[PDB]
Paper text:
However, because of the intrinsic flexibility and irregularity of loop regions, organizing multiple structured loops at protein functional sites has been very difficult to achieve by de novo protein design. Here we describe a solution to this problem that designs tandem repeat proteins with structured loops (9–14 residues) buttressed by extensive hydrogen bonding interactions. Experimental characterization shows that the designs are monodisperse, highly soluble, folded and thermally stable. Crystal structures are in close agreement with the design models, with the loops structured and buttressed as designed.
The in silico validated designs span a diverse range of shapes with different repeat protein curvatures and loop geometries and adopt multiple loop buttressing strategies using loop–helix hydrogen bond networks and loop–loop bidentate hydrogen bonds. From a fundamental design perspective, the crystal structures presented here show that computational protein design has advanced to the point that proteins with multiple ordered long loops can now be designed. Key to this success was the design of dense networks of hydrogen bonding and nonpolar interactions within and between the loops and between the loops and the underlying secondary structural elements.
Numbering used by the authors: 1 to 205
The structure:
């Protein structure tokens, strides 16, 4: 399962700044010439997932290079829903970046998540514990910084307008409405006013 796309993404991940730039230009030319955007490495990691790992771990230059390449992969037809072997999906992984990333990483991930949803990512596809994107993003409202709270608010609205199940519960029974009311009880005045707006948005959906 070795291809030019995967070898070159490896150079974006590990090469010098000059090597990264040349690898990005070679990747675009391969994609433009029809290289398969879906052919995965020996671990079931897709080009999309591998470049999202670069957004999660890379320098500010690497995050920009990977954001550019991720947009081109999605325009090339990369499957926005394909998971790796451990069950990680691009939507879930990008939500992890919102939860743990720097302010620069959060912005990249917010831009990518919108592109992912426009490409057909499943807004209902959950992780192992059964947490939906909806639940995971409400957890960021609860525990994030003010800037994470704001991005999560934006993503939640875009996720409901993309058809997310307002009532879908996780494996333990937890619901978005349950979590939002806990934020209403325990959160800051800013969080309480956000959780109230989100409860009305949940019902309306």
């Amino acid at each position: 399962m070795e291809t030019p796309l995967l070898e070159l993404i490896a150079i974006v991940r590990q090469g010098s700044e000059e090597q990264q730039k040349s690898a990005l230009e070679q990747l675009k030319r391969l994609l433009e010439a029809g290289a398969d955007p879906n052919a995965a490495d020996n671990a079931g990691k897709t080009p999309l997932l591998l470049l999202i790992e670069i957004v999660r771990q890379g320098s500010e230059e690497q995050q920009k290079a990977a954001l550019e390449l991720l947009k081109l992969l999605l325009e090339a037809g990369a499957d926005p829903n394909a998971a790796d072997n451990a069950g990680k999906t691009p939507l879930l992984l990008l939500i992890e970046i919102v939860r743990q990333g720097s302010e620069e990483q959060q912005k990249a991930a917010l831009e990518l998540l919108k592109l992912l949803l426009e490409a057909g990512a499943d807004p209902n596809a959950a992780d192992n514990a059964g947490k939906t994107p909806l639940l995971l993003l409400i957890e960021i409202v609860r525990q994030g910084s003010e800037e994470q709270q704001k991005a999560a608010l934006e993503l939640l609205k875009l996720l409901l307008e993309a058809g997310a199940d307002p009532n879908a519960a996780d494996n333990a029974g937890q619901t978005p409405q349950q979590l939002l009311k806990a934020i209403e009880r325990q959160g800051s005045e800013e969080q309480q006013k956000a959780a109230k707006e989100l409860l009305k948005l949940l019902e309306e959906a």
